[model samples]
Target: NEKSGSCPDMSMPIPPLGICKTLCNSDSGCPNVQKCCKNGCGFMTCTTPVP
Candidate 1:
């Protein structure tokens, strides 16, 4: 058996990129405009906000 919290099951298919894109579109999905970003499973953000 695989260890807990390990990588997702390879047997299970991965979702498409579109799903991630949709998540980034939401406000709650991403962090505040000015703050250290917590990189999601697919989405990405910066540590600082743009002026």
Candidate 2:
């Protein structure tokens, strides 16, 4: 996954691969197809939207 603060603005839409990475405070912290969701371990991580 991309680094948390690497992109100044994610102009391009990045698709999700069902993988989780570090912390995320909001949707802005993740790529277009993902959002900041709380993991079972109790911290927010990037995940794709549910069907």
Candidate 3:
């Protein structure tokens, strides 16, 4: 599922596949079609669809 903006919360955990090399604090923080995934506090990953 493609989402906009950062995750609702940073305190929440994330799945392994949701982990990305980049971190996004907001929707603008990520690239196009990517959303922030929370792995840890203040840690995030940009996620997007394959196609």
Candidate 4:
């Protein structure tokens, strides 16, 4: 189970990135403009948001 919490069913189809660096529950856990977004399998990963 992910500590970041499970995502909605609409959040599916996210391609797995082969292991996330950090698991976060919110943007506060991320660093320097890196927002907490869905990476894969309903898990959240810290990364810069895309334009």
lDDT by candidate, in order shown: 0.34, 0.53, 0.52, 0.57
* Poorest 10 consecutive residues by lDDT, candidate 2: 2-11
Candidate 1 Cα misplacement greater than 4 A, ranges:
1-28, 34-43
Give the clashing pairs for model 4.
none
lDDT of 4 by residue, 1-50 (tens): 23333333345455665764547767676656566777565567765454
Model 3: lDDT equals 0.52
User: Residue by residue across 1-51, what tens digits does model 1's lDDT show?
Assistant: 211222222223444544443233332334544232334344433233323
Residue runs of model 3 more than 4 Å from their true location after superposition: 1-22, 39-42, 49-51
Residue pair clashes in candidate 3 = none
The positional error of residue 42 in candidate 1, measured at the CA in angstroms, is: 9.6
Error of 4 at 35 (Å): 0.4
lDDT of candidate 2? Answer: 0.53
Identify the runs in model 4 with alpha carbons over 4 angstroms from their true place: 1-17, 20-22
Q: Tell me which of candidates 2 and 4 scores higher on lDDT.
A: 4
- TM agreement with the true structure for every prediction: 0.18, 0.44, 0.37, 0.45
Q: How many backbone clashes does every candidate have?
A: 0, 0, 0, 0
Q: What lDDT, from 0 to 1, does candidate 4 have? A: 0.57
Tens digit of lDDT per residue, candidate 3, span 1-51? Answer: 345333444344455564345466645567777666554433666654333
Tens digit of per-residue lDDT, candidate 2, span 1-51: 433433223324443555444677766766675667565344566665543
